[PDB]
Structure 1
């Protein structure tokens, strides 16, 4: 709700982001074709999602900064940094869809699967990352928190990249071993690959702009946010197989890609040796029938039910964490976030 009534402003502000990332180089006509390609990459890859992560920076900003400091300029910096978080996401998805061999994202074909794009998408992803820091400099160069944001974004990228490394190492193609698909291993992957940049990063950016730079305050916010992030990726795993493609906007690949998903960890925990053997011989393979075999085993073990029960318990667990760790921050900062991802 407090997002929805602030979304439209955010989405519209994108045109100025795309304008300013393009006119910055008007005094360099020779790179015109590159700047055009960057436009195309932005319009295709920073748009069509829910913008939750960017809206969070903005929403949290209004809650953290005293109203008599929210000038038209502080507001503009807030949603630029918001779009910066969306660019980080755009950067990671473009590359992730190549490495996961995905087909669609946000209701359209993956950038790299577009005729004419292919593996040039790799440089496209890097430009999106670069755009972040061009904007931080254009809008926040002179702010007291400038360097804090730079380091926040860089650190968040390294963490996400460590996460992706765990995510790929644990899912070797053509290499089944269900034995590495454990609960500890799972929690490590999603903490790094999702939770830092999706939940800590947006709120922390807002915090730093609000002048809240205390190590102890960030640690507290972090305790809540990384746990939210853990649930959010479990939800992403569940929806990869059981979600509605018209809603999720994309086709799941976790079983074919041999991924350490929450679903496969839960399945391993409940399976008889007969069932385990069936998973062993059908997982991590590209054949429709073998994937359907795994899905059927999940439903036989009533994992969709198990998931629905974990969403209730997780939600209670996160609310408690908010009771313990929210202050001095307004609990609504975390509640509007929790509200957005639960049910």
Structure 2
């Protein structure tokens, strides 16, 4: 609830600590400052918070220090996210994000944002070392952040092969595979995995078990994001949807294609152009195949299945850690 406020207030310190007794390079550190402030503030903080919330839920040993290390690693997750978005926005030619102008679209930034994004990545490891250098799960954390990065990158590769800016490539299997690698791992496993390691919980099986739960949650959450992109109330969301315009391998086109011949063709002409003549065409076709109802039915089945997953795979972790996230996404 309000806990999010306490997490954002810790951003000040994060930036202090990453910005300093070699004065040769101050101009660069100022620039880093600006990059962090533009690019790590603005969102909803759910992934960073998840680290903190999951840490409280998972430990007994909660000294002022122990906590600080939590809001730091949370901020690391946020930093990894900023690195990806800054880079994704360039790769996509996006205009806005959070809706401010994308960092790279700022006059005088342009493609320098590639280096800025790499700096954001690097700040992860500077933080870990600053706060996470004496603890025993230090190495475990570094490895997790690196593995999460790699997965996310592989997924982005997959995405960019699948959806260069042709519908044979939009399969279920491809779609699930993009979501798992591009989104689910860093969005759902990373934050909890990280709380796990902070809380002493380092076993392969526990992590695997948690992984199984969290990737499925990830899958649903991105499917819901795709549904809501088109059929969400724009002011319950704070957006209007452009998945269709952008030739995106959305879950709605996967399912539409599974249920199309002369509607295949109708999708050819209208998926991935810019005027709401042609967005209207597909939306309305989605309505005609009852994708909303397919979605309702998926959300019901998917929830059933997450709960079965929790019953089965959670112990000896507190089910609450997984149920907290579930309540929030569903």
Same fold, TM-score > 0.5, yes or no? yes
Q: Classify 1:222/1:77 alpha carbon distance in 2 versus 1 (closer, same or farther; 3 Å).
A: same
CA distance in 1 between partners of 2:237 and 2:97 (Å):
8
Gaps of 5+ in 2: none
What secondary structure sits across from 1:31 in the alignment? helix
Aligned to 1:325: 313
* Conserved 8 A contact 1:106-1:250: no
1:315-336 deviation line (CA, Å, top 9, x unaligned): 1211110000000000001011
SS in 2 for 1:287: coil
Match of 2:167 among 159, 174, 178: 178
Give the one of 1, 13, 18 matched to 2:15. 18
Higher deviation after alignment, 93-102 or 161-170: 93-102
Match of 1:151 among 137, 140, 143: 143
In 1: Cα distance, 2:36 partner to 2:236 partner: 22
**1:8 aligns to 2:5 (yes or no):** yes
- Deviation, structure 1 residue 251: 5.4
Gaps of at least 5 residues in structure 1 are: none
Instruction: Return the structure number with greater relative CO, CA threshold 8 A, min gap 6.
Output: 1
Report deviation, 1:147. Answer: 0.5
Checking the alignment, whether the CA contact within 8 Å between 1:256 and 1:286 is kept in structure 2 is: yes
Aligned length: 329
Distance 1:81 1:233 in 2: 24
Q: Distance in 1 between matches of 2:154 and 2:71?
A: 27
The superposition leaves residues 10-41 of structure 1 with CA deviations (integer Å, 9 ceiling, x where unpaired) of 1101110011111xxxx122222221121111
Q: Which residue of 1 aligns with 2:293?
A: 305
Shift of 1:78: 0.7
Q: Distance in 2 between matches of 1:116 and 1:19?
A: 25
The answer on whether the counterparts of 1:267 and 1:298 sit within 8 Å (CA) in structure 2 is yes
- Structure 2 CA distance, aligned partners of 1:117 and 1:145? 37
User: When the two structures are superposed, what TM-score results if normalisation uses the length of structure 1?
Assistant: 0.91
Against the structure 1 CA distance between its residues 160 and 258, is the aligned structure 2 distance closer, same or farther, given a 3 Å change threshold? Answer: same
Deviation at 1:5, TM superposition (A): 3.7
Structure 1 residues 51 and 206, CA gap change in structure 2 (3 angstroms)? same
